[PDB]
């Protein structure tokens, strides 16, 4: 098993899990999405330890097993400083790789803008540089949904009746369509989803659900700042990703030399839909930029 700890990072206790590889060729830090999820759904990335890649997992502020700071700190800027404090505490001055998923991808991009000197490479999976853009794209996904679910989401969503059974059913369909497709949801994914509903960060920073971003990050957009990132960057996105390839395209065009990969038949949690292929792509990227 990996090493689990509860350390004080920037004033609050943060839970982390460090899965070391027998031969530490590289260190990979990971940022779960949400905002307000947990590291659990990214556990399939542990497979990379077999390739000499040490993987660091952690529950961000107010998420999963970590303590919640004052709401005034519920910001991506605070998340960035938290990540850097954790990196330094565990790895000192060693350069590491950083991977982010969904909101975690936006957080990783923000991190790179200020701390890319501490990185050998950046990986963004189903990430975004603009929340407004992400919302625009998900709205199109709702429209392309079969009338039954599309109609329920538009109707009850317009009145804010998120408790309605038909709405809940529509939400579930969307998730099985753009979050994790044609796959039995593993416990690790169920756990992160549960942590989302149990803690407060998801409700406050994000909103009711994935496609309903009413939270404090609704207007967030650093598209005009990511061009500053000049380190090797790998961008992945699923064909049916809830955070669409168009959103990924915008990141790709701003980051010079970045590589973009659209996983056909997959959606957001590509690390579960094509676990082997996903881990193989990331490990290849990492082993080429040591």
From Swiss-Prot:
<dbReference type="Pfam" id="PF00561">
    <property type="entry name" value="Abhydrolase_1"/>
</dbReference>
<dbReference type="InterPro" id="IPR002410">
    <property type="entry name" value="Peptidase_S33"/>
</dbReference>
<keyword id="KW-0031">Aminopeptidase</keyword>
<dbReference type="InterPro" id="IPR050266">
    <property type="entry name" value="AB_hydrolase_sf"/>
</dbReference>
<feature type="active site">
    <location>
        <position position="241"/>
    </location>
</feature>
<comment type="function">
    <text>Cleaves H-Pro-AMC as well as a wide spectrum of amino acid substrates and several peptide substrates without a proline at the N-terminus. Proteases F1, F2 and F3 degrade oligopeptides produced by Tricorn (themselves probably produced by the proteasome) yielding free amino acids.</text>
</comment>
<feature type="active site" description="Nucleophile">
    <location>
        <position position="102"/>
    </location>
</feature>
<dbReference type="InterPro" id="IPR029058">
    <property type="entry name" value="AB_hydrolase_fold"/>
</dbReference>
<comment type="subunit">
    <text>Part of the tricorn proteolytic complex.</text>
</comment>
<dbReference type="GO" id="GO:0006508">
    <property type="term" value="P:proteolysis"/>
</dbReference>
<dbReference type="GO" id="GO:0016020">
    <property type="term" value="C:membrane"/>
</dbReference>
<dbReference type="GO" id="GO:0004177">
    <property type="term" value="F:aminopeptidase activity"/>
</dbReference>
<keyword id="KW-0378">Hydrolase</keyword>
<comment type="similarity">
    <text>Belongs to the peptidase S33 family.</text>
</comment>
<feature type="active site" description="Proton donor">
    <location>
        <position position="268"/>
    </location>
</feature>
<dbReference type="InterPro" id="IPR000073">
    <property type="entry name" value="AB_hydrolase_1"/>
</dbReference>
<keyword id="KW-0645">Protease</keyword>
<protein>
    <recommendedName>
        <fullName>Proline iminopeptidase</fullName>
        <ecNumber>3.4.11.5</ecNumber>
    </recommendedName>
</protein>
<dbReference type="InterPro" id="IPR005945">
    <property type="entry name" value="Pro_imino_pep"/>
</dbReference>
């Amino acid at each position: 098993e990996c090493i689990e700890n509860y350390a004080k990072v920037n004033g609050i206790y943060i839970y982390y899990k460090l899965c070391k590889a027998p031969e530490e060729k590289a260190k990979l830090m990971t940022m779960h999405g949400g905002p307000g999820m947990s590291h659990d759904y990214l556990l399939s990335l542990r497979d990379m330890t077999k390739e000499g890649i040490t993987v660091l997992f952690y529950d961000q502020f107010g998420c999963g097993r970590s303590e919640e700071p004052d709401q005034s700190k519920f910001t991506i800027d605070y998340g960035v400083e938290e990540a850097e404090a954790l990196r330094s505490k565990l790895f000192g001055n060693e350069k590491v790789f950083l991977m982010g998923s969904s909101y975690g991808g936006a957080l990783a991009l923000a991190y790179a803008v200020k701390y890319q000197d501490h990185l050998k490479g950046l990986i963004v999976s189903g990430g975004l540089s603009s929340v407004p853009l992400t919302v625009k794209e998900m709205n199109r996904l709702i429209d392309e949904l079969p009338a039954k679910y599309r109609d329920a989401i538009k109707k009850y969503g317009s009145s804010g009746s998120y408790e309605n059974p038909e709405y809940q059913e529509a939400v579930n369909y969307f998730y099985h369509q753009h979050l994790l497709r044609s796959e039995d949801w593993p416990p690790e994914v169920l756990k992160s989803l549960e942590y989302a509903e149990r803690r407060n960060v998801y409700r406050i920073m994000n909103g009711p659900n994935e496609f309903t971003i009413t939270g404090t990050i609704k207007d967030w957009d650093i598209t005009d700042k990511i061009s500053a990132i000049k380190i090797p960057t790998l961008i992945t996105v699923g064909e049916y990703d809830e955070v669409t390839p168009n959103v990924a395209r915008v990141i790709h065009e701003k980051i010079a030399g970045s590589e973009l990969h659209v996983f056909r038949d997959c959606s957001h949690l590509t690390m579960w839909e094509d676990r082997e292929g996903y881990n193989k792509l990331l490990s290849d990227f990492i082993l080429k930029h040591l």
